[PDB]
Design a protein around this ligand. Structure first.
Ligand code: BCL
Ligand code: BCL
Ligand code: BCL
Ligand code: BCL
Ligand code: BCL
Ligand code: BCL
Ligand code: BCL
Ligand code: G2O
Ligand SMILES: CCCCCCCCCCCCCCCCCC(=O)OC[C@H](CO[C@@H]1O[C@H](CO)[C@H](O)[C@H](O)[C@H]1O)OC(=O)CCCCCCCCCCCCCCCCC
Ligand SMILES: CCCCCCCCCCCCCCCC(=O)OC[C@H](COP(=O)(O)OC[C@@H](O)CO)OC(=O)CCCCCCCCCCCCCCC
Ligand code: SF4
Ligand SMILES: [Ca+2]
Lengths: 50, 114, 360, 101, 647
């Protein structure tokens, strides 16, 4: 539960497990379309790990 | 104890036979410009259709004077420019980087997990 | 004010071409206390080599160590005639003197050293371009004559001959006597172990002055590879590369306040061929590092180091690990950063590599 | 991570066949040397394994003291393509310095 | 252009160079201050208005050094104050250049005592270094970060003292006056003091630097400071438009600015400059002396937003150039460490994590895909808006993206939220992505590219113009060439910035055009501010006023010349130029010998492709932005009266 909430505030912090490219993409997504687009990114990737 | 020598250190402050592999040359000519103007051992040989790579580099060993300007420049992109040492060993570069066994260090908990 | 800092300034001025002749200028200081239980400890060293005969390989090497330690003007002079015979054998005629306070005595030796590696495998030397660890053994056969001019000399001669003729473990405890203080703790820290000596003879004969005691003994320095006297046997005697006189004038003054070291030398063997046309500042001897690590781990220090390699004009450094901070078109300078970390590494006992591959 | 180790132009570390001599009559005189030029090696079975695996790339220069033509296994049905053994393949670098001015 | 390379210079040389440049800059500041003296302290009329002083007049009047008061009285006082501060800058710059010379020459011997201090070991300012540092940074930039933070803390403290006492602005918390800048000057002291202490006791580590890194640390800090400049530009735009800054930036509009090169009172041809000069001819406007620079009201000129735009775009251009240069110099360092083999030996994320070529390819592919998507979206929006407003293919403005305002959650950033702001944001993202393609190519593909590792080629010289026509062409593949392409690509994002801040309607190319529905945007989109004309018609509207100025017209012609001169070197012409220059040499030789017996023995020089690209990008950027200066210096010319529907 910590990872998903940290993600909703800090998505790239959530994808930190993923590769550096994914982390940079999630950071850019925070920069552009903050929260909705990047929250979408984090939920996709984290649910995929599941 | 007190008797000593003395000293003051003001630290505190208080042969070569360079060749070109015609197989790998791309005819850039970055080595030609380094050749001395009168020597001009390195020359261009054209097969055809320059864009298809016909142009290539050749060192006329008779003209070469073993000055090392071509090879020491580190200018050959293809590695064709080689040096055969007096005992004999082909050098594609002045110094190749050491070979390494590499792996992506991804930490476990803090920095780059997994 | 209570900050321990190790300031230093090293300089290597090389000579172009096949000449490996290099000039080493090293200044250093550090406010850390020394490890000498007797302080202050001041010493000067003069080491001059003159090629006596290029054909026979004989080189006359004169070493003068002067020192004052708790007010004891010690002075050891020695002039030897080192000469290769094979790739694994050297002969050394020589004379010398040692003077402590008022006491003093001379000696004259006819030694022979045979450095035999434990293996000469072609695979190792054809696969490893830079063979550092080469295990081996080094048999010294020393015949030394001392004029017995003092009462102490004769007393020591009597005591030693009595010990040899009466004690059955002299050949084994002589190492305990001989590696005074921490020296025995140093041979184990460098991979060295000295075998029991073989005292082939103790005699006394009339000489130019009086009774001269002649001792013929043998021992064997055993190196596991980390010993520079074995792996670098040919590398440490560049008589072939010696064309002119070489000098090394060093010194260190070490009081409780701190240590100050000054060295100025010019001698061959500084640059050795590494293959591929790349000359290399020679592999660092490991015995100095692993022996000075027995003293350099005793205080945390801030490194302020600067290495100035003045290449001959036309040469360029292709590899530098750590890399050179600056370059005045020939004077590559290492200062701070990974070089400081490496200086801390080797000031504390590290044997890490510092590759400097320069070529024209 | 593989392009930055060794020369970046050779994915497989390259080994020129510099010296070979017929006098020893065993052809063990074949002395492979990497393009780095620090290891005068020999064609051992481990080198054979590396060559077949593609880790290394043995090559031959044209301008040299001749290595061994038809004395070190050679295929001449086409233009010569020297082989240490039929399964091996020593690709000859061609070097046209004499034919051209 | 490489004489002062980082390698050629050591840390003390850099200290001295920066110090001497600070002194030179202080001299420049004194020059600008004196240029700002409208009335001399002796009574006579003073210098006209320069952009160099109209850029700093808001700040100077904020500090009370200058005054917006218009009587000769107290303007004489402002001139005297400016002269005093310029003299202070002059003397302090002299001292700074002296220190810079000493550090550059390494002769750090006190002229009084003669003691030669050591850059490696030196107590700072005397006892303060002992209290705080306990001894200097023995080596290392990491151990220098804390000391520099303490130095900046002392700078902040000194500015607090100066503004409290010298300029009379006491520290008061309220952030609506210069007084807070005193307050915060003390705050940021403690912060940059305390942090410094921390970074002195607990140094930071990025081992890539610290070792042989004047170029590496320079690159990182130049990229950082470029982003600092971009942030400063955004902050300047926002704040200078806030009411709290109106007393210093909005009151420009109330003043009349006599600027050099502006329209001058013209005179008839039959004019004699004797006495009253009336009998001979008639001057253009009477009551002003002949050839005098006529007044220009700041209300029409919009000098508030003109100065704001000049400052903001100065910082934005400098920051983008600094980001590009930092990536370029970092690429040079990357290539050096790749050639010498240290690349694989670096043990930090800033180098290791992108060590794999797969991750580099994926990063650049993501950047390229995002760039394609955003550029295609914005360009489709803009061209469709143009198709609609021009009523092409039977369209009309009703089909344009007038509905596509920024979402209500993002309209706070924009005063009048319209499609213009949407296109601005997305164009900025797209231009950033475009330039990032080249920046990432520099960062990763500095020594080898996936094509080139497949093609068996390596990038060594970091400036090689090419490797030839092999593989169909290898033009412009060095990191220097990628830097040039990055600059030429960021030209467009920077333009978008200029056109946004100068009031243009960048959502369509033909806003305000007298054709079809181009003038209907204000009605259909319900805009409050009447944006300056669109991307193509903005040229025309702004040139209405550029052409009215002889000085701006001269700049127009000169920048245009400079721009088109760039093609002679950027185009694939170097070989043609070399052949032609050989012909030129032979022509000069034989023509001179026939015309004059003296022989020549001189050749016309032709730039190499590397130097050709360098000069071509310099000229391209120079012309483009010397003309953007005209766009930003004509006047804001964006009124708050929307245009009614065309019908
Ligand atoms: C130090 C590690 C080894 C050692 C390794 C070597 C090596 C290696 C050599 C000898 C050699 C000699 N050894 Mg021994 N030997 C050791 C212990 C001893 C002891 C003893 C009581 O400890 C004795 C009596 C001897 C006896 C001797 C002599 C018979 C002989 C000539 C010495 C001479 O040149 O000295 C003159 C005195 C000096 C040179 C004083 C300074 C000594 C230091 C170690 C030299 C440093 C060089 C410096 C880094 C470079 C300076 C450049 C200058 C221009 C020279 N060895 C220990 C066990 N021995 C040499 C030989 O082969 O003889 C035939 C020889 O090459
Ligand atoms: C078994 C592990 C080691 C090894 C361990 C030892 C040891 C231990 C000693 C020798 C000894 C010797 N070995 Mg060995 N030896 C090795 C491989 C070799 C190789 C080689 C082809 O590389 C060579 C040329 C030699 C040859 C030799 C001589 C240098 C020496 C002969 C002493 C004698 O009188 O007879 N060995 C292998 C790799 N060898 C002796 C010697 O004199 O040491 C100095 C000795 O005591
Ligand atoms: C009897 C002793 C041996 C001998 C033993 C050793 C040993 C052992 C080593 C060397 C090393 C070196 N020796 Mg020697 N060396 C001998 C004779 C010579 C002669 C000669 C022709 O006479 C020459 C020119 C040299 C030259 C050299 C260099 C090639 C090399 C150091 C390179 C470096 O950059 O140094 C830089 C030099 C400095 C930093 C200055 C050092 C100054 C001090 C004063 C010298 C060391 C003193 C030591 C700590 C104390 C000795 C006390 C003893 C108890 C008497 N040696 C004699 C015959 N030599 C070393 C090397 O690198 O091997 C590869 C090494 O390991
Ligand atoms: C143009 C795009 C990039 C850029 C691209 C390059 C390129 C490309 C190169 C450098 C090079 C260098 N750059 Mg840069 N670099 C940029 C920004 C910067 C900034 C900065 C403003 O923060 C700095 C400090 C540096 C620093 C440096 C040095 C590390 C290095 C050597 C410069 C010097 O000695 O040149 C000597 C010449 C200079 C002093 C600059 C020229 C200006 C003249 C001398 C100024 C005074 C006269 C007058 C006012 C203006 C000129 C025109 C007149 C008609 C005469 N760059 C810009 C934004 N940089 C070179 C180097 O060697 O890299 C390793 C190199 O090849
Ligand atoms: C604001 C903080 C900026 C910065 C701003 C500048 C600027 C601006 C300049 C430098 C200059 C230099 N910088 Mg810097 N610098 C920063 C951080 C660094 C760091 C570091 C972090 O440790 C390093 C190692 C360097 C390295 C260097 C040297 C290459 C050079 C100083 C040597 C000297 O003056 O030569 C002796 C040379 C002279 C004194 C002659 C100078 C000639 C004229 C007056 C200036 C030439 C360049 C050009 C006209 C300035 C253009 C600015 C543009 C308007 C954007 N910079 C950051 C990123 N630095 C100067 C340089 O030489 O640039 C090429 C320079 O002008
Ligand atoms: C504007 C003046 C210039 C300058 C010009 C000079 C001059 C001139 C001299 C030195 C000397 C020295 N400089 Mg300085 N130097 C500058 C900045 C630096 C910086 C830095 C903080 O980045 C460094 C590393 C140094 C390094 C050094 C030392 C090696 C040496 C002093 C030894 C010490 O114990 O002195 C203790 C004090 C110092 C460390 C000085 C620190 C710098 C201060 C700010 C100089 C101010 C001079 C000014 C006229 C007086 C104004 C004081 C007010 C309180 C503001 N300078 C300043 C910014 N430098 C001096 C010398 O050799 O001393 C023996 C000397 O005479
Ligand atoms: C972030 C703070 C600083 C920064 C600090 C540093 C430092 C420190 C170093 C570099 C270095 C480099 N920098 Mg940088 N740099 C920044 C901005 C940039 C930008 C840019 C336009 O934004 C670019 C293109 C570059 C480009 C480069 C290269 C020249 C070089 C790395 C080469 C390499 O192999 O990387 C390999 C590829 C990567 C490591 C990719 C992954 C990125 C890393 C892990 C961190 C950022 C991503 C972060 C986790 C994203 C998610 C969260 C968000 C923060 C919200 N920098 C900003 C201004 N840069 C190094 C160099 O050698 O300097 C000379 C170096 O030492
Ligand atoms: C003002 C703009 C230009 C010129 C001025 C000019 C001059 C010129 N050029 Mg050019 N050029 C372009 C612009 C200009 N090219 C563009 C935009 C392209 C992109 C396609 C381009 C391309 C090529 C190729 C491919 C080749 C050349 C040459 C070649 C010449 C050598 C001899 C010759 O042609 O003399 C005939 C040309 C003249 C002597 C021109 C007369 C001077 C003038 C009235 C005034 C000069 C104004 C000055 C430039 C402003 C500032 C100066 C000062 C204040 C700092 C030569 C003097 C080549 C040769 O060497 O072969 C002949 C060749 O091969 N080009
Ligand atoms: C993160 C998303 C990226 C988009 C950035 C937002 C741009 C919109 C913007 O201007 O903000 C909108 C704000 C205010 O937006 C309003 O816009 C109006 C025009 O219609 C006027 O400018 C008003 O003053 C202003 O309030 O404008 C600014 O802050 C302008 C300052 C410069 C901002 C752009 C700098 C970007 C530099 C990158 C250059 C790329 C080079 C390659
Ligand atoms: C900012 C950039 C800094 C400087 C770069 C700026 C710079 O280098 O310019 C760019 C470019 C110079 O590049 P080139 O290498 O081709 O110059 C060769 C010259 O010698 C002209 O042939 O200039 C042009 O070609 C256009 C202007 C040339 C006009 C000059 C005319 C020269 C006359 C020569 C005699 C002609 C008579 C013919 C006799 C037969
Ligand atoms: S056109 Fe010019 S830049 Fe391009 S490959 Fe050919 S020579 Fe190089
Ligand atoms: Ca305008």
């Amino acid at each position: 539960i910590r990872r998903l909430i940290l993600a909703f505030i800090l998505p790239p912090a959530a994808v930190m497990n993923k590769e550096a490219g994914t982390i940079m993409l999630t950071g850019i997504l925070t920069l552009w379309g903050w929260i909705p687009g990047v929250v979408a990114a984090l939920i996709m990737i984290s649910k995929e790990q599941s | 104890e007190p008797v000593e020598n003395k000293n003051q250190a003001p630290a505190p402050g208080a042969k070569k036979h360079y060749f070109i592999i015609e197989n790998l040359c791309v005819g850039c000519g970055l080595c030609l410009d380094k050749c001395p103007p009168k020597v001009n051992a390195i020359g261009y040989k054209f097969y055809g259709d320059v864009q298809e790579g016909g142009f290539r580099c050749y060192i006329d060993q008779a003209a070469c004077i073993s000055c090392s300007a071509c090879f020491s420049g580190d200018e050959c992109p293809s590695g064709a420019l080689i040096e055969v040492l007096p005992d004999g060993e082909v050098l594609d570069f002045s110094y190749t980087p050491p070979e390494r066994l590499d792996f992506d260090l991804r930490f476990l908990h803090r920095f780059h997990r997994e | 004010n209570d900050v321990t800092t190790a300031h230093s300034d090293y300089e290597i001025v090389l000579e172009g071409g096949s000449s490996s002749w290099g000039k080493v200028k090293a200044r250093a200081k550090v406010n850390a206390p020394p490890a000498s239980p007797l302080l202050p400890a001041d010493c000067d060293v003069k080491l001059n080599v003159k090629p006596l005969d290029p054909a026979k390989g004989f080189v006359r090497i004169s070493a003068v160590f002067e020192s004052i330690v708790d007010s004891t003007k010690n002075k050891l002079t020695i002039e030897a005639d080192i000469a290769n015979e094979t790739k694994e054998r050297r002969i050394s005629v020589g004379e010398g003197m040692v003077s402590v306070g008022d006491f003093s005595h001379t000696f004259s030796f006819e030694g022979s050293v045979v450095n035999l590696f434990y293996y000469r495998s072609d695979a190792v030397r054809r696969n490893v371009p830079n063979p550092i660890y080469m295990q081996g053994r080094q048999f010294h056969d020393i015949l030394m004559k001392v004029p017995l001019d003092n009462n102490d000399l004769i007393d020591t001669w009597e005591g030693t001959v009595k010990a040899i003729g009466s004690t059955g473990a002299f050949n084994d405890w002589i190492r305990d006597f001989w590696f005074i203080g921490p020296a025995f703790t140093a041979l184990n820290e460098g991979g060295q172990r000295i075998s029991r000596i073989e005292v082939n003879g103790l005699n006394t004969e009339s000489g130019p002055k009086g009774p001269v005691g002649v001792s013929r003994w043998r021992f064997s320095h055993g190196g596991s590879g980390m010993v520079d006297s074995i792996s670098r046997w040919a590398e440490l005697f560049p008589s072939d590369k010696l064309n002119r006189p070489a000098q090394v004038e060093a010194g260190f003054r070490s009081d409780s306040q701190g240590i100050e070291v000054k060295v100025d030398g010019e001698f061959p063997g500084v640059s050795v061929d590494a293959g591929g046309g790349l000359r290399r500042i020679l592999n660092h001897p490991l015995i100095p590092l692993v022996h000075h690590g027995m003293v350099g781990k005793f205080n945390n220090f801030n490194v302020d180091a600067q290495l100035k390699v003045v290449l001959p004009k036309g040469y360029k450094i292709r590899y530098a690990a750590p890399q050179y901070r600056s370059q005045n078109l020939e004077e590559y300078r290492w200062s701070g950063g990974a070089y400081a970390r490496w200086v801390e590494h080797v000031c504390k006992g590290g044997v890490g590599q510092f590759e400097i591959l320069y070529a024209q | 991570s593989g392009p930055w180790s060794g020369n970046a132009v050779h994915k497989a570390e390259k080994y020129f066949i510099t010296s070979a001599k017929r006098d020893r009559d065993g052809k063990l005189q074949i002395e492979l040397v990497p393009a780095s030029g620090r290891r005068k090696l020999s064609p051992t079975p481990e080198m054979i394994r590396r060559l077949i695996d593609g880790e290394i790339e043995i090559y031959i220069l044209t301008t040299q003291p001749d290595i061994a033509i038809d004395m070190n296994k050679e295929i001449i049905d086409m233009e010569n393509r020297y082989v240490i053994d039929f399964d091996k393949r020593g690709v000859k670098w061609t070097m046209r310095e004499i034919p051209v001015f | 252009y490489q004489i002062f390379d980082t390698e050629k210079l050591d840390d003390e040389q850099v200290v001295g160079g920066h110090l001497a440049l600070l002194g030179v800059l202080g001299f420049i500041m004194g020059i600008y201050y004196i240029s700002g003296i409208q009335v001399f302290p002796w009574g006579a009329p003073g210098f006209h208005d320069n952009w160099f002083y109209l850029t700093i007049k808001p700040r100077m009047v904020s500090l009370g050094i200058d005054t917006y008061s218009t009587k000769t009285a107290d303007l004489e006082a402002a001139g005297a104050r400016l002269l005093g501060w310029a003299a202070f800058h002059f003397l302090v710059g002299s001292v700074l250049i002296f220190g810079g010379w000493r550090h550059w020459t390494h002769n750090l011997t006190n002229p009084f005592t003669g003691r030669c201090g050591n850059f490696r070991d030196f107590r700072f300012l005397g006892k303060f270094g002992d209290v705080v540092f306990n001894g200097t940074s023995a080596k290392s930039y990491k151990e220098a970060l804390g000391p520099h933070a303490v130095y900046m803390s002392l700078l902040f403290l000194g500015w607090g003292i100066v503004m409290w006492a010298i300029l009379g602005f006491a520290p008061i918390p309220d952030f609506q006056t210069i007084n807070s800048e005193t307050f915060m000057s003390f705050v940021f002291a403690v912060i940059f003091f305390a942090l410094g202490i921390y970074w002195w006791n607990n140094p930071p580590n990025a081992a890539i630097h610290l070792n042989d890194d004047m170029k590496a640390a320079f690159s990182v800090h130049l990229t950082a400071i470029g982003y600092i400049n971009i942030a400063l530009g955004c902050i300047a735009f926002v704040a200078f438009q806030q009411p709290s800054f109106a007393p210093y930036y909005k009151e420009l509009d109330k003043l009349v600015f006599y600027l050099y090169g502006e329209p001058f009172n013209r005179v008839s041809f039959n004019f004699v400059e004797q006495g009253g000069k009336v009998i001979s001819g008639a001057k253009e406007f009477a009551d002003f002396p002949a050839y005098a620079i006529l007044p220009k009201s700041g209300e029409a000129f919009g000098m508030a937003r003109v100065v704001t735009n000049l400052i903001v775009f100065n910082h934005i251009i400098c920051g983008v150039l600094y980001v590009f240069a930092g990536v370029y110099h970092g690429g040079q360092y990357l290539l050096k460490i790749q050639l010498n083999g240290m690349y694989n030996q670096i043990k930090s994320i800033w180098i290791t994590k992108g060590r794999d070529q797969e991750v580099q390819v994926k990063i650049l592919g993501t950047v390229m895909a995002l760039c394609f998507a955003t550029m295609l979206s914005v360009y489709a929006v803009i061209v469709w808006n143009t198709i609609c407003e021009l009523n092409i293919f039977g369209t009309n403005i009703t089909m344009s993206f007038y509905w596509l305002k920024p979402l209500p959650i993002f309209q706070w950033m924009f005063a009048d939220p319209s499609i213009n702001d949407w296109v601005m944001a997305h164009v900025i993202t797209a231009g950033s992505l475009f330039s990032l393609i080249a920046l990432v190519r520099i960062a990763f593909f500095a020594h080898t590219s996936p094509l080139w590792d497949d093609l068996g080629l390596k990038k060594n010289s970091y400036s090689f113009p090419c490797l030839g026509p092999v593989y169909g062409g290898t033009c412009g593949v060095s990191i220097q060439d990628q830097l040039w392409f990055a600059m030429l690509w960021g030209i467009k994002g920077l333009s978008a910035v200029c056109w946004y801040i100068d009031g243009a309607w960048i959502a369509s190319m033909m806003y305000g055009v007298p054709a079809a529905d181009a003038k209907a945007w204000d009605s259909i989109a319900h805009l409050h501010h009447h944006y300056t004309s669109g991307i193509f018609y903005y040229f025309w509207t702004e040139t209405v006023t550029i052409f009215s100025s002889s000085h701006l017209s001269t700049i127009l012609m000169i920048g245009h010349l400079v721009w088109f001169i760039s093609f002679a070197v950027w185009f694939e012409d170097r070989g043609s130029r070399l052949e032609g220059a050989d012909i030129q040499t032979r022509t000069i030789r034989w023509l001179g010998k026939k015309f004059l017996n003296r022989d020549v023995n001189f050749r016309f020089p032709v730039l190499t492709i590397s130097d050709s690209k360098l000069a071509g990008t310099f000229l391209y950027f120079g012309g483009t932005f010397m003309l953007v200066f005209l766009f930003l210096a004509n006047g804001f010319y964006q009124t708050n009266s929307p245009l009614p529907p065309p019908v």
